[PDB]
Structure formats: C-alpha cells, structure tokens
Amino acid sequence: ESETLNPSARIMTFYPTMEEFRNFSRYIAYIESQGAHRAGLAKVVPPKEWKPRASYDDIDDLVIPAPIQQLVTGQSGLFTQYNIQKKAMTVREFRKIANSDKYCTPRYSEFEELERKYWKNLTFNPPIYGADVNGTLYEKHVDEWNIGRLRTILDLVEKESGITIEGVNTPYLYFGMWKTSFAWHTEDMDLYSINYLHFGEPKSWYSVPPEHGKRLERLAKGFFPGSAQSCEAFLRHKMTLISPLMLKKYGIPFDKVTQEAGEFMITFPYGYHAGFNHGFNCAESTNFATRRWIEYGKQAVLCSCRKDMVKISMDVFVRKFQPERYKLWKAGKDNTVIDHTLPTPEAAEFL
Ligand SMILES: N#Cc1ccc(O)c(-c2cc(C(=O)O)ccn2)c1
Ligand SMILES: [Mn+2]
Ligand SMILES: [Zn+2]
C-alpha cells in the first residue's frame, strides 16, 4: 500500500550501487517504490566511482549572459523577490565577486546558525545569481544520469512538435553565491526535476509534501491576496519566499535537507520547494517525466497572467498512455482524482 510506505513523508537519501545507478528511470521508479516521492524531494548520492566531468578547471571563461541581482522585500518571514538583470560576465568575474568580502559566506558553526542568518539578512546587501545559463558540464560520453539526455517520456514533447523549452527539456546551469535564493514553487506543468551540484559550497532545500501542497497554497493566497487575485497560480512567478518558522506557525508540514557538491536532488510532481546557496557553487538541472506525471500534467493549474509562461500540450501523452480516456478527456469530462501516495506504474517490477 502507498500509505504504508514513508508514512511521515520525510526526505529520503539513497546510495545506489553502480549497477543500480545505470538505469535512470528504473531507479526513479524504485525510489518511488520506497515512498520517496511522498516527501516531494529526495537526495541521491552517486557511487564514488562516478564523475560527470574529469576537470572543472576550464570554465572561468564561460559566459553568464544574464546575471540576476536579487532584491528581496518583506518582514515577519514573508518576502517577495525582485529580479534585476545585470550585464553579462564570466565565471571568473562572478567567482571574484562571490568570494569578495562584500558578498562571501559569513562564518558559523552549525547549519542552524547559517540558516538563521539567511532569514535575518535576506533583504540586505542583494547578491547576484548566475541563473538560467544554457548549457551542460557533462562530458559528451557520460551515459549515467546525463541531464542533457535522460531519455524519459518528456522527450515526446520535442519528438512530436520540435518545441524546446529552455531549462525544461534542455539543461540549465546555476552559478551561486551566498544568500542567493530560489522561491517556493512546483516545476512547470508540475514535472519532476533533477538537480546536480557540480562543485562549490552547499545548497539547502525546504520541501512540502505533495499531499499537503494545497495547504501551502491556501496559506500563500491568504498572505498575498493581491497577487492571488491577479493570478490563478502566482507561486509560478517564483518570487515568493516563506520562512520555515512561518510554515511551522501555520501547521504546514515540511522538511529540510542540505545538498553537497557531487550530490543529486530529485523533486517530484507537485512537490513545492525553496532554498538558498551557501556560497560560490555551480548546479545543473532540467525537468523530466514518468507515466505517473501525466495525470499531474493534465491537471496542473497554470499562470494566467503572462503570455510567456510554460504550457506543454498534454494531448500526445493522453493519446499514447491513456487511450481509454482520450475521448472523455477531450470532452472535458475526465474526473480522475490524483492519489499523491501512489508510485509510478514503471515500478511494477519493484512493487
Ligand atoms: N526562477 C525559477 C525556477 C524555475 C524552476 C526551478 O526548478 C527552479 C529551481 C532552482 C533551483 C536552484 O536555483 O538551485 C533549485 C530548485 N528549483 C527555479
Ligand atoms: Mn525547482
Ligand atoms: Zn501569473
């Protein structure tokens, strides 16, 4: 039973062997079989034997075409992040700024100390995030967990229509510095995501279980009624930051995890997450899908107030994987209800 596995919906950590690590979709289905998805977020530590690139010593020349300065406004654990686009710059130039005294990591003993400082100084001295950089740091030959070519069914989007959506079915790189942030969100079309930390200081994550996502939404709508009235899904703007103390105070279940260089994070459909970087680092990510995602995709509530928001046609997926329901679905009469505790069909061999 779905409900009997990971009943506390806690973030799980997995240490696959090299044999397990080789088939990406298999291991995703496997960790789902262990209830990992119920947390919304999971950590996967790859075998020590494994490395996606021999050396990162060459990248100081790589261009960050649109660095973003992150202005944050708010109080009492509620904040809204405004992006200001800076002029292009190099990893060398970025690293110099990031390690500079003005911008570098404050010192501290335990994580909770660094965490407290993040939520205390969030609004002061705005950092720069080298974000949404198109590209990959994977060497052309690495066949395990290659973010450039995961070969999941998300590939049906490009295959059928030729459409690429930057960062979604293509890779993004993220160059961080201390106190740079990602706001509370689910992925576009409530897909999965994979995030790999190539190098640098840690990246910390908060997550809310999918079975409690709607609860976080009610709370957010209550605290940002203006934004809620203007948009059916304003959290998709990725501007909204909420401190873990505010989540506790209003009884939203959540969990924390800190990601180290060379570690993977997997986010699951309708898994709300947010977080921040500890210092200079580099992360790579993209979205992907499983058969389980399709229903999430069919029902995802999208941003209504922008023309350039990401919308994937679900049609090809329903035809190919839910043929019984296609007619009904197209007639707007498909009332399937989602069970967030259930694992993906592909795990039939591990169920
Ligand atoms: N803006 C934005 C945005 C859109 C989609 C995403 O998955 C993330 C995101 C970014 C990070 C990160 O900046 O490290 C971690 C997790 N999620 C951020
Ligand atoms: Mn994300
Ligand atoms: Zn919107």
Curated annotation (Swiss-Prot):
Main function: Histone demethylase that specifically demethylates 'Lys-9' and 'Lys-36' residues of histone H3, thereby playing a central role in histone code. Does not demethylate histone H3 'Lys-4', H3 'Lys-27' nor H4 'Lys-20'. Demethylates trimethylated H3 'Lys-9' and H3 'Lys-36' residue, while it has no activity on mono- and dimethylated residues. Demethylation of Lys residue generates formaldehyde and succinate. Participates in transcriptional repression of ASCL2 and E2F-responsive promoters via the recruitment of histone deacetylases and NCOR1, respectively.
Entire protein: shown range: 4 to 354 of 1064
Residues making up the signal peptide according to the UniProt record: none
Residues in coiled coil: none
Lineage: Eukaryota, Metazoa, Chordata, Craniata, Vertebrata
Residues that coordinate or bind Zn(2+): C231, H237, C303, C305
Domain JmjC as annotated: residue spans: 139-305
Post-translational modification: Ubiquitinated by RNF8 and RNF168 following DNA damage, leading to its degradation. Degradation promotes accessibility of H4K20me2 mark for DNA repair protein TP53BP1, which is then recruited. Also ubiquitinated by the SCF(FBXO22) complex; leading to proteasomal degradation.
JmjN domain: residues covered: 11-53
Family: Belongs to the JHDM3 histone demethylase family.
Effect caused by changing G167A: Abolishes histone demethylase activity
Residues involved in 2-oxoglutarate binding: Y129, N195, K203, K238
Domains as described in the record: The 2 Tudor domains recognize and bind methylated histone H3 'Lys-4' residue (H3K4me). Double Tudor domain has an interdigitated structure and the unusual fold is required for its ability to bind methylated histone tails. Trimethylated H3 'Lys-4' (H3K4me3) is bound in a cage of 3 aromatic residues, 2 of which are from the Tudor domain 2, while the binding specificity is determined by side-chain interactions involving residues from the Tudor domain 1. The Tudor domains are also able to bind trimethylated histone H3 'Lys-9' (H3K9me3), di- and trimethylated H4 'Lys-20' (H4K20me2 and H4K20me3).
Name recorded for this polypeptide: Lysine-specific demethylase 4A
Tissue: Ubiquitous.
Effect after changing G130A: Abolishes histone demethylase activity
Description of how the protein assembles with itself and partners: Interacts with histone deacetylase proteins HDAC1, HDAC2 and HDAC3. Interacts with RB and NCOR1. Interacts with VRK1. Interacts with FBXO22; this interaction promotes KDM4A ubiquitination. (Microbial infection) Interacts with HTLV-1 Tax protein.
